[PDB]
């Protein structure tokens, strides 16, 4: 059993997609770690994800 100290996208399959979805719609390789990182990003990452 891990916790989010190891990372919050293993913590769920919807947390894994975010950020995967993200980059993709963003068109930024980079924003896929975005999402990975503190939740402060992760909300950020769903606003996009709104319309998906």
């Known amino acids: ?10 913590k769920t399959k919807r947390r894994e997609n975010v950020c995967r979805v993200c980059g993709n719609r963003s068109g930024n390789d980079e924003y896929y770690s975005e999402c990975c990182e503190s939740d402060y990003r992760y909300h950020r990452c769903l606003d996009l994800l709104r319309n998906f």
Do not use: L, V
């Not at 059993?1 to 293993?10: G, L, P, R």
């Open 1 to 10: 059993t891990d916790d989010e100290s190891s990372n919050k996208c293993a």
